């Protein structure tokens, strides 16, 4: 937006193995889950009509926002993405009731998340 960025030259944003890994491996596969479809759209607040979302939920994020910072090389490595990825899941659990479809989906979505994360390069290699 006009203020907070998704890409910035002065701000470090190198390409490491972990970074490129989670981008194409983790979130892109999370994306391919047919239950991850309600997370295909970022919280624009207006588009999805979520005005009080920005009041209750701390960091209104999803999967399109995470991948946006990833493809724009916002961080240095995927370790920084572990923050936004973590919030996207909790956000759904908090705003939505545990009996909601989106919650039921998020629970299953989380499986492939940790699945690919456990297989992450535990050493890291800057490209």
């Amino acid at each position: 937006p006009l203020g907070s960025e998704v890409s910035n030259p002065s701000k470090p944003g190198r390409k490491t193995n972990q970074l490129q890994y989670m981008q194409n491996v983790v979130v892109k596969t999370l994306w391919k889950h047919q239950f991850a479809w309600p997370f295909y759209q970022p919280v624009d607040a207006i588009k999805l009509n979520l005005p009080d979302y920005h009041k209750i939920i701390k960091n209104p994020m999803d999967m399109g926002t995470i991948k946006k910072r990833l493809e724009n090389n916002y961080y240095w490595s995927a370790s920084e993405c572990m923050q936004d990825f973590n919030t996207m899941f909790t956000n759904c659990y908090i705003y939505n009731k545990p009996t909601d479809d989106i919650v039921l989906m998020a629970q299953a979505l989380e499986k492939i998340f940790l699945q690919k994360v456990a297989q992450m390069p535990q050493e890291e290699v800057e490209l």
Partner: peptide
């Protein structure tokens, strides 16, 4: 929307 997207 938010509320059972089935």
């Amino acid at each position: 929307g938010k509320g059972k997207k089935k």
